[PDB]
Amino acid sequence: AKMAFTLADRVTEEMLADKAALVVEVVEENYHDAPIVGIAVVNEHGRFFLRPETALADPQFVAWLGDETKKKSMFDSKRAAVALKWKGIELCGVSFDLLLAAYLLDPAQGVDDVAAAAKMKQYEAVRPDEAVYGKGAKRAVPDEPVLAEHLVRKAAAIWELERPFLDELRRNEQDRLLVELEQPLSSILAEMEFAGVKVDTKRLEQMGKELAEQLGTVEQRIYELAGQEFNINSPKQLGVILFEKLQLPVLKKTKTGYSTSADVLEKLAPYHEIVENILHYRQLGKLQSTYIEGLLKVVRPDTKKVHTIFNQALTQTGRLSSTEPNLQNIPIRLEEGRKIRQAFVPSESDWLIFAADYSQIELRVLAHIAEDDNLMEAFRRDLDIHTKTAMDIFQVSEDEVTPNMRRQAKAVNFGIVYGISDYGLAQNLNISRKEAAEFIERYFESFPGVKRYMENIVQEAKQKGYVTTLLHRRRYLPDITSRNFNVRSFAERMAMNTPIQGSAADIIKKAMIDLNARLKEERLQAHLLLQVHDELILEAPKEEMERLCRLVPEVMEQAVTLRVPLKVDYHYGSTWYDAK
DNA sequence: GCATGATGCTT
DNA sequence: GAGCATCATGCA
Ligand SMILES: OC[C@H]1O[C@@](CO)(O[C@H]2O[C@H](CO)[C@@H](O)[C@H](O)[C@H]2O)[C@@H](O)[C@@H]1O
Ligand SMILES: OC[C@H]1O[C@@](CO)(O[C@H]2O[C@H](CO)[C@@H](O)[C@H](O)[C@H]2O)[C@@H](O)[C@@H]1O
Numbered sequence: 299a300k301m302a303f304t305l306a307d308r309v310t311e312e313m314l315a316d317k318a319a320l321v322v323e324v325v326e327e328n329y330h331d332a333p334i335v336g337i338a339v340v341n342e343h344g345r346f347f348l349r350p351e352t353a354l355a356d357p358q359f360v361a362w363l364g365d366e367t368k369k370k371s372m373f374d375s376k377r378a379a380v381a382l383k384w385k386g387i388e389l390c391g392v393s394f395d396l397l398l399a400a401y402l403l404d405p406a407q408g409v410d411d412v413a414a415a416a417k418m419k420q421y422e423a424v425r426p427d428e429a430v431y432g433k434g435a436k437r438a439v440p441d442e443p444v445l446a447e448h449l450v451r452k453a454a455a456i457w458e459l460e461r462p463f464l465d466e467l468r469r470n471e472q473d474r475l476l477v478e479l480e481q482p483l484s485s486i487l488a489e490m491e492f493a494g495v496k497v498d499t500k501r502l503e504q505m506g507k508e509l510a511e512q513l514g515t516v517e518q519r520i521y522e523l524a525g526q527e528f529n530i531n532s533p534k535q536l537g538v539i540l541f542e543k544l545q546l547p548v549l550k551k552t553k554t555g556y557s558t559s560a561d562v563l564e565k566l567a568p569y570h571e572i573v574e575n576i577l578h579y580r581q582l583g584k585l586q587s588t589y590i591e592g593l594l595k596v597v598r599p600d601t602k603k604v605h606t607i608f609n610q611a612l613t614q615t616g617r618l619s620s621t622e623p624n625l626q627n628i629p630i631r632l633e634e635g636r637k638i639r640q641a642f643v644p645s646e647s648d649w650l651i652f653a654a655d656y657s658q659i660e661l662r663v664l665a666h667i668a669e670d671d672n673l674m675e676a677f678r679r680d681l682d683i684h685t686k687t688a689m690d691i692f693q694v695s696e697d698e699v700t701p702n703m704r705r706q707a708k709a710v711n712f713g714i715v716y717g718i719s720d721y722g723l724a725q726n727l728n729i730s731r732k733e734a735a736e737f738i739e740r741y742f743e744s745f746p747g748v749k750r751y752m753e754n755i756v757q758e759a760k761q762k763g764y765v766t767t768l769l770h771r772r773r774y775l776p777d778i779t780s781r782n783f784n785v786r787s788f789a790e791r792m793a794m795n796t797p798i799q800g801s802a803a804d805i806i807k808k809a810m811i812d813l814n815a816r817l818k819e820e821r822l823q824a825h826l827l828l829q830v831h832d833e834l835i836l837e838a839p840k841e842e843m844e845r846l847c848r849l850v851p852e853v854m855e856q857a858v859t860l861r862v863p864l865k866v867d868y869h870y871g872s873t874w875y876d877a878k
Numbered sequence: 879g880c881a882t883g884a885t886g887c888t889t
Numbered sequence: 890g891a892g893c894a895t896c897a898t899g900c901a
């Protein structure tokens with residue numbers, strides 16, 4: 299039942315047709331400077347397997363890869379593009395990416411290989427990658443015969459599935475979303491990842507040493523106050539010290555045992571001096587283990603750069619994620635952790651970091667979609683939205699809004715931006731679910747348009763089976779009809795929140811595409827380095843800062859036209875820390 | 879070795 | 890709330 303193909307010893311003309319399904323296999327999860335283990339090509343002339351050493355050395359094949367007029371259909375083209383970039387080879391003409399197509403059709407399926415995408419259309423003549431390569435320590439590239447058949451079968455699947463996937467995308471009015479947004483963005487992400495971000499390793503190592511000293515000191519104080527040594531990082535061992543030896547009250551429990559989360563510890567601080575030290579230990583340990591040690595582990599020793607990998611096909615909101623290292627959660631709230639950003643520097647001499655972020659894009663999107671008169675007017679006046687929200691829900695003038703009032707209004711807005719439940723709000727504000735509900739009710743009284751939107755979108759999700767974003771991204775919500783309160787409730791919150799978060803995701807993605815086109819037209823050397831949800835980070839010659847101050851915000855603010863203005867703040871400096 | 883729980887960082 | 894990590898702990 300095997301599939302016929304040619305195990306080529308050399309590249310031939312028929313292998314270079316103007317349309318083909320192409321597989322450039324990179325098995326390592328992190329594809330940066332990784333091996334390409336095999337190549338498969340499927341076109342009108344047949345199916346072929348090529349050894350990388352020969353194909354990638356062949357002038358004709360390389361030229362074919364870089365020829366934009368020679369169209370290729372692939373799965374996870376970014377992976378191939380980046381691996382090739384590390385080899386000095388350009389990949390152009392990718393007209394269809396099955397990974398992104400499957401992702402847009404249904405992001406909940408978690409499609410991570412050709413077999414999974416193929417199963418969506420009842421095509422199963424291809425094996426899952428895990429079945430071929432294995433997992434974990436058992437992972438390995440199989441003998442050529444097995445490897446070759448697998449790559450050819452993946453190419454064959456891509457060749458066959460392009461049409462049915464494009465047809466459904468078209469039916470969903472998502473064809474442009476794929477071809478004009480996600481695929482072009484994939485190439486931009488490839489460039490960003492390959493460029494990488496330069497790291498001041500000496501700085502990190504310095505901080506690391508200072509942290510180690512501070513950790514040792516606090517660690518000893520903890521054992522001193524506890525009257526014995528124990529594993530502080532062990533909730534079980536810590537729980538015994540706090541709730542048994544010291545008799546602190548148990549305010550919250552977890553499946554396993556006593557909760558020792560920061561939230562719980564804060565409340566116990568008044569009872570014993572050991573508590574504040576545990577909190578301080580947790581903070582220092584977080585910075586040391588996750589950030590300092592974590593970053594140093596993935597920095598390339600030769601260039602001192604980190605090359606993250608953006609997962610463009612994971613979230614059901616349409617936002618991008620980042621891994622190895624995750625550069626979307628570097629500390630900023632507290633000054634101590636914020637200092638870590640001083641370690642991210644420009645990659646060239648006399649260059650600077652330029653960062654631009656949307657100001658409240660989620661709430662502005664909500665104002666637009668819900669057509670709430672009060673919210674739209676607030677943004678048209680460029681009001682401090684948290685202060686404004688406080689004025690309305692607490693019924694007071696601007697000068698009557700106290701700091702605590704603004705903080706709680708901000709939390710209410712935070713809940714709307716991330717679609718948290720009333721229990722979530724209650725927990726965040728440390729108040730009763732009942733009081734949190736009253737805040738929500740007060741908010742809806744002040745923003746009736748938002749209330750109407752929330753009611754209507756849940757109804758629409760139920761009727762159609764999914765909700766959509768500004769650029770037609772879709773999220774199916776089968777749990778919307780569940781008779782299990784918690785399950786149904788979460789689905790309703792996602793129905794309300796996905797159009798907001800998802801539309802904001804669509805906007806910044808388009809902004810990235812528009813920005814790169816503008817940078818090219820303007821002949822600027824400036825280039826994108828990172829995307830952190832509502833923020834874009836670039837680096838460029840110091841001589842280009844003034845031009846970027848006008849160009850970047852303009853492009854970002856004009857990415858789309860909403861019923862309210864889009865506002866972008868920006869700053870630049872010698873390090874990411876200073877770009878604020 | 880590897881799965882899962884508790885924890886905490888960002889937006 | 891999600892996605893990404895950590896370390897500890899159990900088992901396997
Ligand atoms: O290449 C990224 C792309 O690959 C998938 C699998 O198809 O994820 C793999 O690579 C990621 C980055 O190294 C890992 O986080 C993930 O664990 C691994 O399976 C897609 O999800 C992703 O879009
Ligand atoms: O020195 C390591 C040894 O100490 C214990 C406590 O007896 O844990 C300490 O060190 C760990 C690694 O530095 C921390 O994770 C932990 O929080 C700290 O108390 C033992 O578990 C370990 O064998």
Ligand SMILES: OC[C@H]1O[C@@](CO)(O[C@H]2O[C@H](CO)[C@@H](O)[C@H](O)[C@H]2O)[C@@H](O)[C@@H]1O
Nearest residue numbers: 752753754756757760778779786787790
């Ligand atoms: O009381 C109506 C109000 O309830 C919500 C949940 O807060 O939805 C419930 O009632 C709907 C009937 O109109 C059902 O479709 C839905 O499944 C049920 O949870 C709100 O959406 C609605 O405004």
Ligand SMILES: [Mg+2]
Nearest residue numbers: 655656657658
């Ligand atoms: Mg912002």
